[PDB]
Design a protein around this ligand. Structure first.
Ligand SMILES: *[C@@H]1O[C@H](CO)[C@@H](O)[C@H](O)[C@H]1NC(C)=O
Ligand SMILES: *[C@@H]1O[C@H](CO)[C@@H](O)[C@H](O)[C@H]1NC(C)=O
Ligand SMILES: *[C@@H]1O[C@H](CO)[C@@H](O)[C@H](O)[C@H]1NC(C)=O
Ligand SMILES: *[C@@H]1O[C@H](CO)[C@@H](O)[C@H](O)[C@H]1NC(C)=O
Ligand SMILES: *[C@@H]1O[C@H](CO)[C@@H](O)[C@H](O)[C@H]1NC(C)=O
Ligand SMILES: *[C@@H]1O[C@H](CO)[C@@H](O)[C@H](O)[C@H]1NC(C)=O
Ligand SMILES: *[C@@H]1O[C@H](CO)[C@@H](O)[C@H](O)[C@H]1NC(C)=O
Ligand SMILES: *[C@@H]1O[C@H](CO)[C@@H](O)[C@H](O)[C@H]1NC(C)=O
Ligand SMILES: *[C@@H]1O[C@H](CO)[C@@H](O)[C@H](O)[C@H]1NC(C)=O
Ligand SMILES: *[C@@H]1O[C@H](CO)[C@@H](O)[C@H](O)[C@H]1NC(C)=O
Lengths: 206, 121, 206, 206, 206, 206, 121, 121
């Protein structure tokens, strides 16, 4: 059938350790955006904070292409965790024991199109809770995301705004906003602009 | 099955001739596949002759056909050409092409076959 | 041996990433139900509660069919996780340190094909507890089940009634009812809807 | 080497998803019995009980057969998890997050063909600790074992008497007896019994 | 290169679940000697204790032999967990939830020689903390080690004295010594015996 | 294209249990340097402390070689966990229940072959806090790193200076510095050294 | 050793002859092994003929041999019989039988092979 | 690119005297690979004649011959020599070289194959 034929044919030569791009010199563009649903707790002096976040990563793959003219029906295909490439965007200043709370999910592809890798999770991340200036002080906590191995001239990770959806108003903390900013880190001997993203959560009290 | 291939050109010169074999196909996008030429003898295995990758510049020749046979591909015309010069009388066999997904021409897992044309010298 | 022959023959081509259906464009129908067994506790300050739920998913397969006239004996077959298709129906507002508390089990198939999947689960989900004002206020906690990647023209998630058989009466709360409702959400710009099932747990106090 | 030859030859066609029996219509007899060696915590009215129990499963296989004349010396064959069929008999009213406490172990096989499966476990079950008639009141707690997918004319779960050994006399509770009874959870219209085994533990106080 | 050839040549037929011995009737010799590094806590009246122990195993193999004359350089090879045989010797009175708390380690082989398997572990064992006199009395806890599936006429488990190396003096308990004893107990209806090794840890108080 | 060719052709004969070196007699140099980021807690009399540490391991490989002239573009190849040799270097006096808090990571290689194996982790390690002479006294906690299976004339560990980066100014403890030095524990048998590295973290109250 | 697989029943007969091909074996337990007949001829490599299961029910044949031959076995004598009827000139080949563990006659992994009993017309 | 392995020698001399043949490399690095010699005959398929390692001294031979052939290799010239002494009439075939990455000579994978030279005493 069409589904069986397409799924069997799509993986002829697809070594999962690749960086799909027509020209090896040209970098790849990945889009990153997060949606924060809830805040669990600010925790103790240990300077650690727990949240509930769904991430969203998108990129254009040049090794999964066809056209629907000769393959009527099929319009969205899915691949599991282990056979389709996925960028390794992680949290830098993580404090969880496992360092990665992402519940891996299938990767979605449309026609001759790009991918979406929405992972859910709860993140226990470190902060600087030192607002003892006065109990009523606005605290800024930073979530630092970025690549761990790839960087510079290979992945020009961009940023998209976060979401302000039904964030379950907390009974003790309220947030003013969630800005984000892309940043660069120079190296000892190189001109490659190693990128990263920092999202700031600011809250005073409730 | 809408994925078949056809040949254009025949060779029966005595020796030292020139030829231009042309091959074409339809039913799949002629931009995500690479084509390689294969030869079959009466009794023998299959041998690799000439190949080119999907990118456009990865020309590969066998060890015995380095400076004689050349290969090219026209994406807009949807065709592949093989030019033979200074042929030897030991090349008597059936030539057929095989396609494959993104590759280079070196050993791979071919998907679509075709049918061959006979050259007698 | 007939069972051995059947198990060897049935898997000639069953790429596990398939959607079993004769007509690719036609959608599949999946029936969903749950059975509550117990409620463990609902802490106060944090918004989370624990429940004991056995799920029940039923669907119709097409590539797994035979007729018993030629094969005497076997009437039902069981498949583990990894070799058979199973829809990914998950809980949205999860709060555990994991996104899936399901203890996977085998899938049962009979004759022409009808798959029953019964996972147990100790689910921990986030509720909306804001009824501290009146101690005698009924609390409507929400359990939101649905597909994570599949949706629209592919999986027509139906709904069956819940179950009351056995409850292990609690010492602090009492069940009033277990209503459930299917809902749909429309994407940004598309005619494909996204369905989901919401179950309301109502308890006043004890 | 005889060991290597036997191990190589015994696994020619042994798909581990199959029920071993010469005639597939005939049911299969499985002997089941447990042996509790320790008690960890009965807990307060939270309705949870922790016990340390070693299971014991035995059955007869018709696909592991030979005689010693051909193969001198060898009398016991040991198989890990994955390559040998094992019944999936579980605890119905479990409260553990993992839902399973079995530490999978190798299975032993004799010449003529027999199986012995002895997994240990720390079982966290559910009970009703509601002794309000003064401290002295006998409490009966139940453990419900049975198949999760097999049932009726396929596996007739036979019961053996429990074991009373090295119970580490406790200082807070004492065991009066360990009865065990087989019952049938037959549904409305099935024409095929669904057996199960329930074990009762009785303790008043100390 | 020589190491590559040795590795590719020594695993031609090494079914991991075999018992490598020259004679199928002759038993095999295994030497056992734990080394205790620290006791973490004697814990509450639940009769549990947490200790830090590095176990030790020694046995002789018949399928791993070469002559070092033609292989200059390499003298010791090492195998990961899964490809090399390892005896199933573990703790009996285990109170840990996962039972076995060993971090698996590579196995070392020298020339036509033996194997060493050094696992580190934190063991939650249970003993008899019921001091006869008032709470200040000398308690002797027992650690039991033996095979689970192997036993009698196959592994004549032998004991060697423990170690008194750096003990990290705790602040509330002092030990007297750590003797051990090999016992050929539990000679059941089967003719073969069932050897075991029991170590005694004695401490009164500080 | 070229990336796929290189990835497919580079692993023809790479038995992952290798010790890459041109000559089997010459040892291998492994450069080690750690970087601490924060101190979470000192805990209680159990004499254990928690830290966040990123390791840094560097070595040179001989079987991963090419030159970029014929492979335009690709300059860094990346391998996952399992297909690439990694030295088995870990912590001796580890007090965590898992004995390995390393979140495994990809390995980066370049044309010549230099490798980097930076893992992140949260390390819970034991110490000795029993300074009764003066409650306000500087505490020196030791971390002992080194191999577990390899040792002597095969892998000679070398140490690089540590990192004093943005160590999140704490609120109860302040450190002066982190000296480290190489040590040896040469055994009586044979004359093969047993190297290791010891890092002392010296902290005083704040 | 001790796994001898012996056959008999050589024949040079034209169409219309009835044959009682016999095979015997030893060493292994005959009641726990299925058997299948294979054909090898110089023009080809190997092909199915007919097979039995370990119980004696649901024997399997090939498309070209749906009629004609029959196959039988008796557990108490260690004999395997193939009744061949209505010969045709195309069955010029060797008949070496194969034995496997509990099987279904249809393709399976084999453990014990036999020897040839070449028959020509 | 143009990776090719050309062979020569043209040995058709009678038994007894001598034979000496050499190989060459074009595209790949000669200090990172290993070469083995394969014999192919009109009736036979493949034989592991002999081989050498990338290190330089791991000469491995076949059971057929132990003191009649010898091998040598040179990295500056990018070549390998095979010397055939005490020619006998039983070995007449086509020789070709198979190239591989870091290896020993025993069963190994290959990436590049060479040209065939016909030798007949
Ligand atoms: C790829 O990028 C390089 C960079 O200069 C360029 O020279 C080349 O033309 C591009 N296209 C290819 C290699 O097909
Ligand atoms: C789709 O692909 C087929 C391949 O033969 C081609 O004929 C057709 O024109 C393509 N359609 C579009 C819209 O690209
Ligand atoms: C599938 O359904 C469509 C509905 O529009 C129908 O036209 C078609 O014939 C069906 N069968 C196919 C596409 O094979
Ligand atoms: C069962 O299927 C087989 C195969 O098509 C067929 O020959 C037989 O008639 C079927 N029997 C019934 C009762 O449908
Ligand atoms: C198996 O049992 C059934 C039950 O009556 C019987 O008819 C059959 O002959 C038995 N043997 C088989 C199926 O080989
Ligand atoms: C094994 O021991 C038995 C008993 O002494 C002996 O007869 C036999 O020759 C030994 N070797 C074997 C069985 O290979
Ligand atoms: C190992 O055996 C080989 C062949 O039997 C022999 O040549 C070599 O000297 C032996 N090595 C030693 C150390 O005895
Ligand atoms: C390796 O080193 C040894 C001594 O250091 C030397 O004899 C040998 O030639 C070197 N090369 C090898 C073994 O390939
Ligand atoms: C680099 O690769 C090219 C590819 O042809 C080769 O010509 C050149 O010799 C190589 N350089 C070195 C130093 O090996
Ligand atoms: C063991 O089985 C073989 C095979 O059937 C048989 O020949 C032999 O007599 C049997 N031995 C015994 C003691 O039953």
């Amino acid at each position: 059938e069409f589904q069986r034929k397409l799924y069997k044919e799509l993986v002829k030569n697809y070594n999962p350790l690749e960086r799909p791009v027509a020209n090896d010199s040209q970098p790849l563009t990945v889009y990153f955006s997060l949606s924060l649903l809830q805040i669990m707790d600010v925790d103790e002096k240990n300077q650690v904070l727990t949240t509930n976040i769904w991430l969203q990563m998108s990129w254009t793959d040049h090794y999964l292409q066809w056209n629907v003219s000769e393959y009527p029906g099929v319009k969205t295909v899915r691949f599991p965790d282990g056979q389709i490439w996925k960028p390794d965007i992680l949290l830098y200043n993580s404090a969880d024991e496992r360092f990665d709370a992402t519940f891996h999910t299938n990767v979605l592809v449309n026609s001759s199109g790009h991918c979406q890798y929405l992972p859910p999770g709860i993140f226990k991340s470190s902060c600087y809770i030192d607002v003892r200036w006065f109990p009523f002080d606005v605290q800024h906590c930073k979530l630092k995301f970025g690549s761990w191995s790839y960087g510079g001239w290979s992945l020009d990770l961009q940023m998209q705004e976060a979401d302000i959806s039904g964030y379950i108003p907390n009974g003790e903390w309220d947030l003013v906003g969630i800005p984000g900013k892309r940043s660069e880190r120079f190296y000892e001997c190189c001109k490659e602009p190693y990128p990263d993203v920092t999202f700031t959560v600011t809250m005073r009290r409730r | 099955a809408q994925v078949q291939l056809v040949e254009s050109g025949g060779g029966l010169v005595q020796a030292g001739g020139s030829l231009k074999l042309s091959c074409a196909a339809s039913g799949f996008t002629f931009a995500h596949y690479a084509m390689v030429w294969f030869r079959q003898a009466p009794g023998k295995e299959r041998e690799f002759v000439a190949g080119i990758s999907w990118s456009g510049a990865s020309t590969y020749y066998a060890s015995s056909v380095k400076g004689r046979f050349t290969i090219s591909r026209d994406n807009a015309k949807n065709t592949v050409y093989l030019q033979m010069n200074s042929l030897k009388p030991e090349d008597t066999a059936v030539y057929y092409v095989a396609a494959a997904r993104f590759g280079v021409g070196v050993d791979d897992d071919y998907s679509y076959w075709g049918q061959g044309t006979q050259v007698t010298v």
